Amino acid sequence: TLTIDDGNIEIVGTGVKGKLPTVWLQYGQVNLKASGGNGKYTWRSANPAIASVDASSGQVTLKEKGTTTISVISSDNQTATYTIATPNSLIVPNMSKRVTYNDAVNTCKNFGGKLPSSQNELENVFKAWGAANKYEYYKSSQTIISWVQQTAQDAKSGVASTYDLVKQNPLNNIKASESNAYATCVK
């Protein structure tokens, strides 16, 4: 008798459960609600070789390997299977210290992903994660500024656009420095 809930899904994001969108927010962990049955039940999530899973709550945590294997058997010996292959998008910010477009691009794109089309892509991508504006989350970075495309006018200023989500929104003219925010990796 295996019964799992699929209305509240916990996405690799920051532990948010609602509808499955298309992006992961954080290391790489998701949790689904599935419960065994009467006796022997088997749980597998992303596979132990790559992720740590919670057997009393479909909790899968992956962060580097390739695909994720998740299966669920009812305590009565029923069989369920779910493997990550197409979906499972992941965003990765690269900049433990202030960074430049080229230094971060080598690292971010080295991830096989690409940069956002504009400042809003990151702010909207992060605002969807709930970190760009979690208030207390600022404690991880009171001010988080990302590198953005420059404007025709600011480019001539010899600068690029800078985005600050929790410190004041996006800003323009940043490049004369050579590393004022960081690179973002999506997908």
Curated annotation (Swiss-Prot):
Marked site (Implicated in intimin receptor Tir-binding) residue numbers: 137, 139, 144-147, 151, 153-155, 159-162, 167-168, 173-174, 177-178, 180-182, 184, 186
The organism's place on the tree of life at top rank: Bacteria
Disulfide bonds: C108-C185
C-type lectin domain: region residues: 90-187
Region annotation (Required and sufficient for interaction with intimin receptor Tir) ranges: 1-187
Subcellular location: Cell outer membrane
Region of interest (Intimin receptor Tir-binding), residue spans: 90-187
Family: Belongs to the intimin/invasin family.
Subunit structure: Homodimer. Interacts with Tir.
Additional detail: 'Inverse' autotransporters have an N-terminal translocation domain followed by the passenger domain, as opposed to 'classical' autotransporters which have N-terminal passenger and C-terminal translocation domains.
Role summary: An inverse autotransporter. Adhesin, which mediates attachment to the human intestine epithelial cells. Necessary for the production of attaching and effacing lesions on infected human tissue culture cells. Anchored to the outer membrane by binding to peptidoglycan (PGN) via its periplasmic domain, thus helping in receptor interactions during host invasion. PGN-binding may also aid in resisting mechanical and chemical stress during transit of the bacterium through the gastrointestinal tract of the host.
Domain notes from UniProt: Has a signal sequence, a periplasmic Lys M domain, an inverse autotransporter domain (residues 189-430) predicted to form an outer membrane-embedded 12-stranded beta-barrel, followed by an extracellular passenger domain (residues 450-939) with 4 Big domains (residues 450-550, 559-653, 658-751 and 755-842) and a C-type lectin domain (residues 842-939). Beta-barrel forms a hydrophilic pore for the translocation of the passenger domain to the bacterial cell surface.
Name of the featured protein: Intimin
Organism field: Escherichia coli O127:H6 (strain E2348/69 / EPEC)
Gene field: eae
